[PDB]
Amino acid sequence: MRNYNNFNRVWKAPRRPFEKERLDREMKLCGQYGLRCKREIWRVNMTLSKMRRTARLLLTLPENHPRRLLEGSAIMRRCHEYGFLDEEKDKLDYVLSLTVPDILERRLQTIVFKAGLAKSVHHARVLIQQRHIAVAKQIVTIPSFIVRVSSERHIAFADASPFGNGRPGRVKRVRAKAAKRH
Template sequence: MGDPRKQKKKYVAPKKPFDSDRFEQELQMIGVYGLRNKRELWTHRTELSNYRRQARNLLALPISEREQNERELVNKLARLGILTTDPTLDHVLDLTMENLLERRLQTVVFRKGLASSMHHARQIVTHGHVALDAARVNTPQRLITVAEEDRLQYTPKSALNDASHPARIAASDAARRVSAEGFEGSDKFDRSDRSERPARQDKPEKTEPVTNEAIGPVGGDVNE
């Protein structure tokens, strides 16, 4: 039967490991979109980099040679909802991380009002409460096409089908809040209050225990 296929790494780590500006941007995206760790973010960043590299390579070719490959690339991104109508290779070069993160299953579930927050959306996806055409989907990082978005629903046996379920009520309240305040205002990751945190207090120094030698001989003459 042969050896099992070797799993390849799906992301490329940043070339500069320590960059405070990048740290802030990554932490904000992780908090806003409810990602598990930076590896998930780097996976989508590598995917975006591959799309942009394909676009640059196609732009270097004559129009007659790149026409078919260009149409396949832009149509794929349009089906995923990453690009809008009448997309071109220039639009591919203008893509950002937010364009891909908005098409994640986790994000779409929250956008549709099936969950009360991004983290709740990840929970119900991984626990098998979300279905696509009655087929369970439990991969939060999966990119959802525009056609699949309308077919997302709760699984038939999920307890969330009950409209009186507390999670359903919280999800409805969150959907109304998002429509009123916007997505950024509803689940934004704020790190501006770090300077207001109390300073770390040093631990008290340990005192050495008193020994018999320091006290003196026991039972000695008090007149000495």
Template sequence: MPLGSKTKAYETPNHPFQGERISSEHDLLGRYGLKNKEELWRAQSELRSFRREARELLGRTQGDAEAAGREGEEFLERLKRYGILDDTDGLDDILSLEINDVLERRLQTIAYRRGLANTPQQARQFIVHGHVVVGDRRVSVPSYKVEVDEEESVEFDETSPLADELHPERAEEQ
């Protein structure tokens, strides 16, 4: 087993008992249907790494601007492909990203927003139970990051009983 495979993919808060932070975390857990705070902390750590990389690239543009420019373009393209940034955004805009920008790109959230489920929690259950496909692949990971061009292909698996429009658990049409 590789040495790095046992490390945590997130950092816990420095001050565990802050009422304001706890209530905002609880609100996010409910709004996005997250299973526990670990999932939220993982998304926060991902956002922190985006910001760190953007700061490093911005700092390097003062030195070797050409090399930093290439790396910066690749980084920006990746974030734009996932829909975290808009097409007009630059490296400076990464520093103003919020946790919601990262959580909105999860498969669980997109399945809920597309109307596949009545609640984010139900969307999570449908995904974990294998009822949701992205393109032609069945994805059973609620935290899967959906690219912008994949977003339209998020739907129920055709072999799933939920593919039937009359299934009682299907979301009500708005």
């Protein structure tokens, strides 16, 4: 009862659950990025909505204000750090132009497809969740892992994975047992 650990909600369901324009865009986003459900889109809506709302508050504030120099250089920093904005985009008006496919390109499911470690985007989500990709010699099993810019150089196969330098996986190993009893 006396537990003060915090928790909040990360996604929000849309108003108007049957919009034929919206339902067609989100089925493209579930196909082009290999997503499980519409809720994984909807947290990328709320992630980007909160960036689009704070950056629109800071432009109400003048320049050489304390809450715009601090904390406006923080939101441009995390866009440059996670690959949301390339380094030319530094004016804070580019956060207001970010889209949901700009955030979905930074998921570990997408880079493992774009770096070339997997044939399809549904090949990438299997290999993450089946413990094959290490970001910095750290096995990451989360597909919604947002990859930073500095982490792109070091994505490879895991050192414990059978595809890397680890022991052979199940279908070879249970076949290597069946050839052993004979």
